[PDB]
Subunit: 201 residues, 6 copies
C-alpha cells in the first residue's frame, strides 16, 4: 500500500492556486520512484563487493562502517520518510478535524481556513526544514558531494593505512546527483509555497 | 495488507479531543516505516559479515548467538507487534460490540462509553506497559545503548578470548537511536492519554 | 490475500457471547504475525550457517537432516495451516449453506443453529485437536523444549562422533517460546469454547 | 491475484448437494498453502547443498540432474496447475455461456443443466485423470515413495560410483507425504463426485 | 496487477461462438502459470551452477554466453509478451473506440463489426505470427529441441576445446516441452480462429 | 500499484483522433514489461560474474565501474521514469484543473482546450526530448551500440592492461536492441503527435 494511499489524503480536494501544488507531489512520487530503483539494485553491493586489500581480519568490516555509517539509500529513505511526514500529518489533521466538526454540528469555515490552512503553513515550513536538514547531512556527512573509487581507510584493526574499493561509486554518485538535485528542486517548490504564505500573510 | 487495514479499525470514527490521538498513530505508521527500511536492509549482514578472527570451528556461530540472542530488528518487530495488539484488540472490541448491540435491539450509549471507553483506558495502560517493557529489554539486554565495532567474545568453543567484528554497527545504532527515541516519544503520548483519563477520571 | 480474507468469513456476523470469540482470532492474527517475522528472517541460516567440524563430505547434510527433520518454521507453519482449516471450513460451511437455503426457499433457523452451531462445536474440537497435535510433536520431536548451541551428531558418514553448531539457537528458541506459549493460550481459549458448549449442552 | 480469484468463479453460486463440493476446494486451497510453504523454503537447498564427494568437475551437476529431473516442488506445482485447469475451465465455460445466452434472449434451463452440468461431469473426470496422472509419476518416477539421505550416483563424468548427499531429505519427504496424502484424499472426493453422477446418471 | 487486468479487457463481453475463444485464453493463463513457476525456480542456476572444467579465466562466462544468448525463460517471457500484445492492443482498440463513438453521438454497429471485428482478424493473424516467430527461434536457435547435460564449448579464451555442464538440463527441458507443446496448441486455436474468419469471410 | 494507476489518469477520457494515442501507451506498458523482465533477471550477474583475470585487489571493482557507470537497466529505468513524467504530469494537470474549475463555478471549454491541450503539446515535446535525451546517452555513453564478451580494462589499480569478462553480453545486448528499438518507435509516435499539433497549429 506504498504510494497510492498517501495521495488519497495527500492530494486533497481543493487547497490553493499556485501550479506548484501538484508539481511538488509529482516529484515526491518521481523521487520515490528513482529511490525504489537505486536501493534494491545498486546498494546490495555496497558491503559485499567492498574490497579492502589487507588480510587483517577486523579491517574490512571496520572500513565499511567508519566510512559508510548510514548508507546513502537509507538516508535517501529517511529523507523521503521525514519529508513525507508533514504531508501526511496535515492530510491526517484535515480528514479528521473536517470529518469531526461536520458530523457533530449537523445533528447537534473560519476555522477550516484557520486551523488547517495554518498547520499546513507550518507543515510547509517543516517540509523545507527536513528537506534541508538531510540535504545538509548528505553533503556534510559524506566527504564532499560524491564517492571515490577507492578509499584509504584507517579503520582500527587494519595494519597502518590500507586500501579498500567501493562498488560502482559512479552509478552510486549518479543517483546521488539526481536525488540531491531533486532534493534541491523539492526545496524551492516548498519554499515558494512558504513564500506565497508570506506574501499575502 | 500490512498497515492500511489496521487504520480502517484503528483510525476510529470519533473517540476523543487531545491532538495526541492521531499524532500517536502517525508515528505508529512512521515507526513501522523506519523498521520496514532497517530490517531487510541493514540486518541481512548481521550474521553473514560477522567476522571472528579464529579458525576454531564452533566459535563464530557461538559468538553471534551469545552476543545477538534476539537480534534488534526482531525486537523492534516484536515491539511494533505487542504495542500493535492493544490498538487492534480495542478496535476489534468496538466494531464487534457496537455492531452486536445495535443490530440486536433495533428489531428485537451508557455502555458504549462504559464498556469501550473503559477497555480503551486499560489499553492505553497496556500500550505503555509494552512500549516500556521492550524499551527496557532493548536497553538492559544489549550491553549499553548501542553496539561496538568489534566484540571480544568468550563463546565456548573459541580458543580463550577471540575477536569478532560486526557489520555497520553505526548504521545499526543510528537506527537503534531513532527507534528508541520514537519508542520514548510514543511512550509519552501514550502516558499523556493515560494522564487525561486520570485527570477527569 | 493472506489473513484479510480469512476474517471476511472467519469473523462472521453474530455467533456467540463469550469475549473469547475475537480474542482467539486476534491471536490467530498475532501468531501469524510473529511467524511471518521468524521464518524469512531467522531460519534462512538454519542450513547455511550450520557448521559441522569435520572434513568428511557426507556429514554436514546428514547432520542437519538427522537433526532438523521438519524445521521449526515449517512446523509452526503447518500448525497455523491445520488450526486454520477448521476456522475456514466452518466459515465455508456457513456462507454456502446459508446462501443456499435462503435463495432456494425465498422464491420456491432451527437448522441454522442445528447444522452450523453443531459443526462449529466439532470444529472447536478439531481446533484443539490440532493445536495440541502439533504442540505435542513440537515438544516430543525436538529434544526437549529448545535447541542447544552445538549438537554432537552421529550422522552416518561422519567419522565417529562429530560436533556441529546451529545459528542463533537462542533467537530460534525465543521464537519457539512465544509460538509455544501462544500455542498453549490458543489451546485454552479453544477449550473454553468447547467447555461453554459442554456447559449448556 | 493467486487463490482469491480462482474461487470467485470456482466457488460458483449453486451447483450440487453432496458436502464434498466445498470440502474438495477447501483442500485445493490447503494444498496450495502447504506447497507455497515447501517450495521457497525447503527446495532452494536442493541443488545448492547437494554434495557429491568427488573432485571430478562434471559430476555434481550431472548427479543432481540424473537424479532430480523435474524436482518435487515443480511437480507438486504442475499438479496444482493441471488439476486447477478443469476447475477454472468449467467456471470459465459457465460465466461465459450463462452471461451469453442470458443477455442475448432477454432483448432479442434445459441447456444450463445440459451443456454445463455435462462438461462439469467430464471435468470431474479430468480432475481425477490429472490428480492420478501425477500421483502416478510422483510414485513411479522417484525411486520409491521418498528420498534417501545419500544417493550413489553413476552420472557420466564421475569416476566410477560416487556418493552424493541431499539436503533435508526427511523434511523433503515429510512434505512429499502430506502432498501425496492430500493428493489421494483429493482423488476420492473427485471420484465420489464422479460416482454421484454415475448413480443418478 | 499481472493477469487479473489483462482479462478485464481481454475476456470481452460478447465476440464470437467457437468454444475456442475462452480455451485459448485459459491456456494463455495456464501458460503464464507454468512460466511463473519455471523462471524464478529452475533458471537461477543457469549461470551459477554452470561448470566449465578449465582454470582459464575468460572461459566460463564466454561459455555460458556463446551457448545461452537469450536464455529460455527470457524467450518464453518475450513470447508471452508479444503474443500478449495483439490480445491487449485489440481489447484496447475496443474499450477506446466503443467508449468514444458511444458518448459522442448520444448527446451530439456497422463500424463496430467493421473496425473492430476487422482489426481482431488481423490480431489473430498477429498472434499466430508471433506464437510461430518464436516457436521458430526456440527450435532453430537452441541446438535441436532440448539441452544436453554437458556441452563442449569452444568459447574464445578457453584452452582449445573444454567441457562445461549445465544445471538440471532435464528439468530445464521438461519445461521446454510443455512450453513448446502449449506453444503449438496455442498456435492451432489461433489458426482455427483465423480459419473461421476465412470460411465465412 | 505500479502501472495500473498511471493508466487511470494517463489513459484519460477523450483527447484526440490519431490511432497513435493508445498505440504509444500500449508500448509504454510493453516497454515496462520487457524491462521488468530484463532487470531482476539478467543484470544481477553484471557485477557478480564480471571476471577480471588479475590477482590485483583494487582492479575488478574499478574495472566494473570505469566500464559500467550507470548500468543499462538503471538507464532503461530512468528512461521509463523521465518519459513517464510528462505523461503523468499532464494527466495530473488535468484531473486537478478540471476538477477545480468545475466544482468552483457550479455553485459559485475555451480554457480546457486552451490550458490543457497546450501543456499536453509541450508535454509531447518533453516526451521526445527525454526519449531522445537518453537514446542519445545509451548510444554515446556505452562504447558503440552493444557490449563485447570481454573488455580490456585499464582501471587504475590493475597491473598495466588486464582482461575482464562480462556476463551474457549477448542476452544483455538483445535486450539493449529491443529497448533501443522500442525507444525509437516510441520516439516517432511522440514526434507524429508533435507533428499533428504542428499541422493544424
Amino acid at each position: 500500500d506504498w504510494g497510492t494511499l498517501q495521495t488519497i489524503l495527500g492530494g486533497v480536494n481543493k487547497h490553493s492556486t499556485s501550479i506548484g501544488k501538484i508539481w511538488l507531489t509529482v516529484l515526491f512520487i518521481f523521487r520515490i520512484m528513482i529511490l525504489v530503483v537505486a536501493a534494491k539494485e545498486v546498494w546490495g553491493d555496497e558491503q559485499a563487493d567492498f574490497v579492502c586489500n589487507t588480510l587483517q581480519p577486523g579491517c574490512k568490516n571496520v572500513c565499511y562502517d567508519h566510512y559508510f555509517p548510514i548508507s546513502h539509500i537509507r538516508l535517501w529513505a529517511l529523507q523521503l520518510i521525514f519529508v513525507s511526514t508533514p504531508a501526511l500529518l496535515v492530510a491526517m489533521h484535515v480528514a479528521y478535524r473536517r470529518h469531526e466538526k461536520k458530523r457533530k454540528f449537523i445533528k447537534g469555515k473560519v476555522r477550516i481556513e484557520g486551523s488547517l490552512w495554518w498547520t499546513y503553513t507550518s507543515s510547509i515550513f517543516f517540509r523545507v526544514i527536513f528537506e534541508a536538514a538531510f540535504m545538509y547531512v548528505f553533503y556534510v556527512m559524506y566527504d564532499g558531494f560524491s564517492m571515490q573509487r577507492l578509499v584509504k581507510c584507517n579503520a582500527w584493526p587494519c595494519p597502518n593505512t590500507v586500501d579498500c574499493f567501493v562498488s560502482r561509486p559512479t552509478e552510486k554518485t549518479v543517483f546521488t546527483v539526481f536525488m540531491i538535485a531533486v532534493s534541491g528542486i523539492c526545496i524551492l517548490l516548498n519554499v515558494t509555497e512558504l513564500c506565497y504564505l508570506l506574501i499575502r500573510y
